[PDB]
Design a protein around this motif. Structure first.
Motif, short mmCIF file in Angstrom:
data_model
loop_
_atom_site.label_atom_id
_atom_site.label_comp_id
_atom_site.label_asym_id
_atom_site.label_seq_id
_atom_site.Cartn_x
_atom_site.Cartn_y
_atom_site.Cartn_z
N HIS A 167 51.96 22.05 62.17
CA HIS A 167 51.42 21.33 61.02
C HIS A 167 49.90 21.46 60.98
CE1 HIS A 167 51.68 17.41 58.42
NE2 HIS A 167 51.10 18.41 57.79
N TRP A 211 47.85 23.50 58.22
CA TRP A 211 46.86 22.73 57.48
C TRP A 211 45.50 23.42 57.50
CZ3 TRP A 211 42.28 20.00 58.36
CH2 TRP A 211 41.88 19.18 57.30
N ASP A 242 45.83 26.46 55.11
CA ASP A 242 45.80 26.03 53.72
C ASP A 242 44.39 25.60 53.31
OD1 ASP A 242 45.98 24.42 51.33
OD2 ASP A 242 46.65 22.73 52.55
N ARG A 243 43.75 24.75 54.11
CA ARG A 243 42.42 24.28 53.77
C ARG A 243 41.36 25.35 53.95
NH1 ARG A 243 41.89 21.51 49.66
NH2 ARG A 243 43.68 20.07 49.59
N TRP A 252 41.55 15.81 58.68
CA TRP A 252 42.10 15.51 57.36
C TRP A 252 41.34 14.37 56.69
CZ3 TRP A 252 44.64 11.51 54.80
CH2 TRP A 252 45.27 11.88 53.61
N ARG A 258 39.40 14.69 53.30
CA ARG A 258 39.70 13.80 52.19
C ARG A 258 38.44 13.13 51.66
NH1 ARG A 258 42.47 16.26 49.66
NH2 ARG A 258 42.70 17.78 51.36
N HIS A 289 56.57 14.16 57.92
CA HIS A 289 55.25 14.48 57.39
C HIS A 289 55.09 15.98 57.21
CE1 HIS A 289 50.59 13.84 57.72
NE2 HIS A 289 50.98 14.24 56.52
N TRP A 341 54.50 17.62 53.52
CA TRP A 341 53.32 18.42 53.21
C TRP A 341 53.70 19.86 52.91
CZ3 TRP A 341 51.20 22.63 55.80
CH2 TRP A 341 49.95 23.05 55.34
N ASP A 352 54.73 19.78 49.32
CA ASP A 352 53.55 19.59 48.49
C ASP A 352 52.78 20.89 48.33
OD1 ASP A 352 51.29 18.33 47.16
OD2 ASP A 352 50.30 18.36 49.12
N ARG A 353 52.49 21.56 49.45
CA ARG A 353 51.74 22.81 49.38
C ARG A 353 52.55 23.93 48.75
NH1 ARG A 353 47.47 21.73 47.87
NH2 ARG A 353 47.46 19.53 48.49
N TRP A 409 48.37 10.07 54.16
CA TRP A 409 48.68 11.24 53.35
C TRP A 409 49.60 10.89 52.20
CZ3 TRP A 409 53.05 14.20 52.18
CH2 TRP A 409 52.78 15.42 51.55
N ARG A 464 48.34 11.75 48.49
CA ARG A 464 49.11 12.57 47.56
C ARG A 464 49.70 11.75 46.43
NH1 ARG A 464 46.70 16.99 47.28
NH2 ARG A 464 45.15 15.65 48.30
#
Ligand SMILES: N[C@H]1CCC2(CC1)[C@H]1C[C@@H]3C[C@@H](C[C@H]2C3)C1
Lengths: 34, 33, 34, 35
Positions: free
Chosen positions: A15, A19, A22-23, B18, B22, C15, C19, C22-23, D20, D24
């Motif tokens: 994950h 992540w 993706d970012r 994160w 954010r 999670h 995600w 979502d992605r 999260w 979202r």
């Protein structure tokens, strides 16, 4: 060596990796129009 | 376990990064509102 | 291990899956209109 | 049934799912009034 513990560990690793990928894509994309 | 420790530290760094991401994107997309 | 660890494992798997969806949705929307 | 690191990471994972989800949720909401 609980199956849930091991699966959760591997899933947390994957994950964070996905992540940052993706970012990285999104920060490189937003690092061109600003 | 080394695997549990690695996953724990990765999870903590993941939440921290994160949250920074954010804050970045919320202050960057909070000007449109 | 304990209920905290078991719930945390289930929640971490959830999670990752969430995600991922979502992605995937966002990449499919940005892979057809861009 | 008590590793301090494990308990910390568990609470952090729960809070991470919650944050999260809220992120979202309000993001999809903002993207619901624009589509
Ligand atoms: N974000 C998840 C939450 C669950 C754990 C990290 C990944 C946490 C630390 C280790 C031991 C358990 C299961 C996973 C690995 C509790």
């Amino acid at each position: 060596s609980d199956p849930l513990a091991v699966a959760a560990s591997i899933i947390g690793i994957l994950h964070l990796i996905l992540w940052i990928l993706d970012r990285l894509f999104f920060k490189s994309i937003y690092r061109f129009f600003e």
